[PDB]
Design a protein around this ligand. Structure first.
Ligand SMILES: CC(C)(COP(=O)(O)OP(=O)(O)OC[C@H]1O[C@@H](n2cnc3c(N)ncnc32)[C@H](O)[C@@H]1OP(=O)(O)O)[C@@H](O)C(=O)NCCC(=O)NCCS
Ligand SMILES: CC(C)(COP(=O)(O)OP(=O)(O)OC[C@H]1O[C@@H](n2cnc3c(N)ncnc32)[C@H](O)[C@@H]1OP(=O)(O)O)[C@@H](O)C(=O)NCCC(=O)NCCS
Ligand SMILES: CC(C)(COP(=O)(O)OP(=O)(O)OC[C@H]1O[C@@H](n2cnc3c(N)ncnc32)[C@H](O)[C@@H]1OP(=O)(O)O)[C@@H](O)C(=O)NCCC(=O)NCCS
Ligand SMILES: CC(C)(COP(=O)(O)OP(=O)(O)OC[C@H]1O[C@@H](n2cnc3c(N)ncnc32)[C@H](O)[C@@H]1OP(=O)(O)O)[C@@H](O)C(=O)NCCC(=O)NCCS
Ligand SMILES: [N+]
Ligand SMILES: [N+]
Ligand SMILES: [N+]
Lengths: 388, 389, 389, 389
């Protein structure tokens, strides 16, 4: 069969300890699950399963995907579960949900991701007991999200390795970062994010409506060039040319093409292929290169056939290398900005860029699109979408 | 296409703060991944993906499934990811791996689960800062594993609801518990667990220790069982004796198509013929296996009377009694080697663990049609039907 | 023998998590110890011992009094130690230093107190290990400073007990609080605190800051006081406005014999003529100053009518009203420059703090006989009688 | 102005995380306060003040000295407070109580120390908030007890500095340690500790346990001593065998004037003749007892040859060897029953502990002149001279 994405939605990407500083991830997920149902004309009672990628669920309780679905009104007869492939969790959950319908084990899937890096706690193993001496409380965000398990250094150090192997200077990375901020600021002023964003009510001394990405700001090349390196003491990656820590959620609604036709739904696009490949963890930023090539081969497309591309900009150094290797037209890649300016909610980033890719394809009439991300531990994932 | 299970393996189920008290889950997972490869004659370089269910990964680092796969020798070109559907993660990961091969996106999958509840840390959100007063360090095992998010009480309280709704007395629950211990001790003495268990070497500073047997299997008496106080409700029926324990362990299986296994001369353990997952009310999450098993049997085209062997995970004695009563299958074919009440319940790996016991017991006695099923916290159930080859 | 106070000094009393939010207590103590030596013309090599009262020393390292004395330039030949009688630590340390000289075991003592309640950490006993369940991180400031060990409630609840037995309404407590703020606001503008305060340099990463004035002194109106919610009892009288605050600071004095001061040409601030410490019921700890002051006056041979100036620590508005009513001294001579309700309450240093205000104000107006007194948690009181020279 | 010690007592010195692993210090302190009152025939209502040295009071509540006195039956009218001069706190509290009676401010004092190093918690300053990254939970026992605030290394490193200045080999330190173990093993078998030790009832959920013997006394052999690796310096001399251990316990004495004991028919253990405290370089804090003992003897009018019994705290074998070498007193009269290397070193109570051993051993053999002394972290020493009656 053929699987389509009938609708999509996402929250505003909040800043670290910002708008969603005390909002649990499943509360953000419930808002997005409710949104994709209303935008497609599908009642919650018709959902079979909810697949939400999430990387930092410590302290959220039993199965936060189930909590988000129940809060969204999905009936108890349906099932829900989370999955963790780091930064590709949000996009991989869509591929997994697509397979549920392809094998005939489900009819309607809500797939996506959610992440609240502000709510990540500090932890320590204390069952054995500390007989003597000092011990460390571990930041679960750094440990389970931003630190390579094999080599021990931060993910930003991996971007420094890509910068050396591809010989990307500090000036070329700052130019990529400033260009990313300007494309995002222009898209926000023109309202190109209003379609995909669903407003979220932060209930507090009065409720607050969060409707815009609080990370999108105006950047200047001079202020960027003054920043000190954030990882290597004599390195190239800074806080300006690297993605930020963020909160948010995003999801999509999946069904077969015949099911959408019977319901009179005009889908956002049809999933034509997908792929996931592993690379060396030292250069995990090069993940999207073999993943995109494998997805295009599975779809039968050449790189020149793509009308629009959404590649997640974890770091300026990795994103420059991905565009250089694949050699696609940079004018069709992240036309509304990227994670360097909008933000990077790890569990939801895969579904976030998939939202931007779908609405921009319908807005400009693009026929063939591709979304791809790099994954910590040395992996990449990509998906090809054709418009309907 | 048709997907088969070419081989399977599991570690010994360790006790809480016992043999694996300081062994991370991925070290247990790597041992099982290496085992299913050796038992099938398949090199690690042929694995496409590793899907490991895990419920308590806090503090273990980035994607423990990837760590376990790399330590097992799986090449970096392959992919790996974890999934969390609580107690059914281990069995659901097999169902997900079967779909990768069914859709043609992979050829060889290693699927299973791993859990180290002893290594679960205590946590607290400290970014905002505590200006004054006391705060609580939260046990991640209790919070994210054994506590219902909607009603707030322990999973044992949900079993009390099943005991009340089904009118299961304390005596019927203790009789089920002792019967579970006796079936497990007999299977252990007869060596019916040696085929599925892969030995694990616990490397320590003062000499290494080989863990080869389930550390929870012991002799139980009805007299000592009847004296135990209720562990959740002050005037309830669920005790520490008739409830499953907290444990560590890992289990996995190797998946491939039937034609691929035929080309390699592999004699598979069984064929996955159907599977299903259904949700129920969280108040009575133990009743999950009832609609899940019925849906799996219909998808397989089997009647309940067609089943030759059944493995139903015994989260609680009260929950397991209700499942056998409703489904009405022959209790002599259900958990013939014991259950989680005596063997243990490592949440993330328990789904694949009972799938291991079901596969090896089917081959030794020549059973044709089998079924594995579990209950899932939050009100869900999962079941899988296997046919021998 | 006769013991005199040759000099005195104190830091500005900082707000909780304010100017000294990251300043250790011994750094505040070093500034005051060096100050009392420079104000008296005495080299550090002449100090015999340093006695610094401190209540919350957890996490500051080995013997913070020794650290404060060494950082102040006192040579290693001298000795230093801390003592803990809660809120009366600062004043009791002066009485102890007086006894060292009286018994002939020392010649020159630096005595006082220091407290940094902002730097108090959260703690938990973790050696035995938490096998399962949640536990609480204890605020050492609340536990070891502001919580009665026998009854378990906050010190503010003891003030509620004083309010009931003495029939103290909210209006009389707010009127005392507003009167305390106004006397402190008037004294600060007139510069009556400049002599006793030594400036403290808060060295920071983005420029240094000089702290020279008490940041807790604010303008209070009786209307704003009546709008405050009760802070302890849900239907009580003590609020955050009529109770002292949590603060950081240090204060000290320089002690020597009267003949020693004469040989060095020092004009002393005053002569210690008597002191006393008495215990009371912990339920009504606020009445501590009543029997302690009576015993000190009896030991000195003074009547209440002989006192020209009185400093009674205002831990709570309810406690200070009961002390003034029972002892019956002229309220116009009690805390003429305000009290802890407006200035602040650094627990370890509060005893020496009110001694600083009493000494400098006595010389400013030519008072002959003075008395300082405090209430102590756990049901104790301490008082000292001072005569001008 | 003559002060005598009417009675004394101490608990069994428990091992780190041993018998008193969950016993708070004030509970041990209460047992000793009750014992010295019955051993002297003094009612609790006659005690004026309780002075208890304590070094690690974090998490123990408001003023543990007051809690210990209240639990021992001392009335609320009495006063109590703690003091901290590290390892010399227990002995210094006796000197402070002696001064209260000498200055006429008290008649009957209970002085001593208490310490439960097992109950010391881990702490961290969390008020400002941890925005990102990991932080350290600090062990209050290591930080506030065993770490030099000026140089940052362990107290065992300071002993290495003393071993270097006196050129003390590993062989000479291990021989000194074994001699202390053997002298302690002989004293326990001969029952020379029963008079001073008061039994403590450890009330638990699973039966009460009576602790009446020091559990660290084991008896050592030089072969096992020479095989131990250095505990501080990678190529050092101090090992776990020749260094004192971490322990829990309490000890106290009862002070009064000589006319008071004669008026009550009390026969005192001994008369306090003099005391002294001196500071030294913190790098060589082990040399503390050398100027302190010489100063006390000079103040008492005694020559070193006059001492019939000497109790010098063996913080480390390297430190104790240098002290015996400098004063040159007869090694057969120094620590005749062993020392802290074998019995243990409870920081807050160690000063009063060696004072207990000295008083009872003086009576057992009829010694007339004794001396107790300890070294103090941060570069200090304290000593006291006792004359029998
Ligand atoms: C890089 C990182 C460590 C930043 O930490 P940070 O120091 O707290 O960043 P901050 O913005 O809070 O502070 C950075 C400084 O640079 C400035 N700055 C940041 N972005 C800027 C910009 N875009 N333009 C100009 N100035 C900027 C900030 O204002 C601040 O100035 P300051 O020194 O005066 O406070 C963190 O965002 C990170 O780890 N990102 C990568 C996460 C990741 O790996 N994602 C992909 C997963 S594969
Ligand atoms: C039930 C539970 C709370 C037990 O906690 P526990 O009290 O620490 O278990 P313990 O064995 O350490 O203590 C149990 C008591 O009963 C006794 N006991 C335990 N098992 C026994 C047995 N099988 N036979 C006889 N006596 C037994 C123990 O000796 C002990 O008594 P004691 O401490 O006085 O010697 C815990 O195992 C649990 O939470 N299980 C939940 C399982 C679950 O939720 N699974 C997922 C649901 S889908
Ligand atoms: C009472 C106490 C709990 C208050 O601290 P707190 O809970 O953090 O409350 P705050 O001090 O922050 O101030 C509380 C409110 O009252 C208001 N307020 C406080 N004092 C005020 C005053 N003097 N005039 C007008 N308004 C005032 C504040 O603006 C604040 O308003 P908001 O919280 O609605 O924004 C604490 O200071 C305390 O325990 N003090 C007693 C300690 C003690 O026992 N000392 C004696 C030792 S025995
Ligand atoms: C020295 C110190 C670090 C020891 O820490 P520790 O290693 O936990 O001590 P332990 O006894 O538990 O372990 C010591 C090792 O030496 C062995 N050992 C200890 N004492 C021994 C003895 N007397 N004879 C033979 N062997 C001995 C122990 O069995 C152990 O070896 P093991 O692990 O193989 O069984 C600690 O006691 C210390 O720091 N003391 C300092 C006290 C102090 O500073 N006082 C201040 C006075 S100013
Ligand atoms: N950025
Ligand atoms: N059990
Ligand atoms: N106040």
């Amino acid at each position: 069969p053929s699987i389509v994405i009938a609708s999509a939605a996402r929250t505003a990407v909040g800043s670290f300890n910002g708008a969603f500083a005390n909002t649990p991830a499943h509360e953000l997920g419930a808002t997005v699950i409710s949104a994709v149902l209303e935008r497609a004309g599908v009642a919650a009672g018709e959902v079979n399963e909810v697949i939400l990628g999430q990387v930092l669920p410590a302290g959220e309780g039993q199965n936060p995907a189930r909590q988000a679905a129940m809060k969204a009104g999905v009936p108890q007869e349906a099932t829900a579960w989370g999955m963790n492939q780091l930064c590709g969790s949000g996009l991989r959950a869509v591929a997994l949900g697509m397979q549920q319908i392809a094998t005939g084990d489900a009819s309607i899937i809500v797939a996506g991701g959610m992440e609240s890096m502000s709510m990540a706690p500090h932890c320590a193993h204390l069952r054995g007991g500390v007989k003597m001496g000092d011990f460390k409380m571990i930041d679960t965000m750094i440990k389970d999200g931003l630190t390579d398990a094999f080599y021990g250094y931060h993910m930003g150090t991996t971007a420094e390795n890509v910068a050396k192997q591809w010989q990307l200077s500090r000036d070329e990375q700052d130019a990529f970062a400033v260009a990313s901020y300007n494309k995002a600021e222009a898209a926000q002023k023109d309202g190109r994010f209003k379609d995909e964003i669903v407003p979220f009510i932060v209930k507090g001394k009065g409720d607050i409506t969060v409707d815009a990405d609080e990370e999108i700001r105006g950047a200047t090349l001079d202020k960027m060039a003054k920043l000190r390196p954030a990882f290597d003491k004599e390195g190239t990656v800074t806080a300006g040319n690297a993605s930020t820590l963020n909160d948010g959620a995003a999801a999509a609604l999946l069904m077969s093409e015949a099911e959408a036709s019977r319901r009179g739904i005009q889908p956002l696009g049809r999933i034509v292929s997908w792929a996931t490949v592993g690379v060396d963890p030292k250069v995990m930023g090069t993940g999207p290169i073999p993943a995109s090539r494998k997805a295009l081969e599975r779809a039968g497309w050449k790189i020149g056939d793509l009308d629009l591309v959404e590649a997640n900009e974890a770091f300026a150094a990795q994103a420059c290398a991905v565009n250089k290797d694949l050699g696609w037209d940079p004018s069709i890649v992240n036309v509304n900005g990227g994670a360097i300016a909008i933000g990077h909610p790890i569990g939801a980033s895969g579904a976030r860029i998939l939202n931007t890719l779908l609405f921009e394809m319908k807005r400009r009439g693009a026929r063939k699109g591709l979304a791809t991300l790099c994954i910590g531990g040395g992996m990449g994932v990509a998906m090809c979408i054709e418009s309907l």
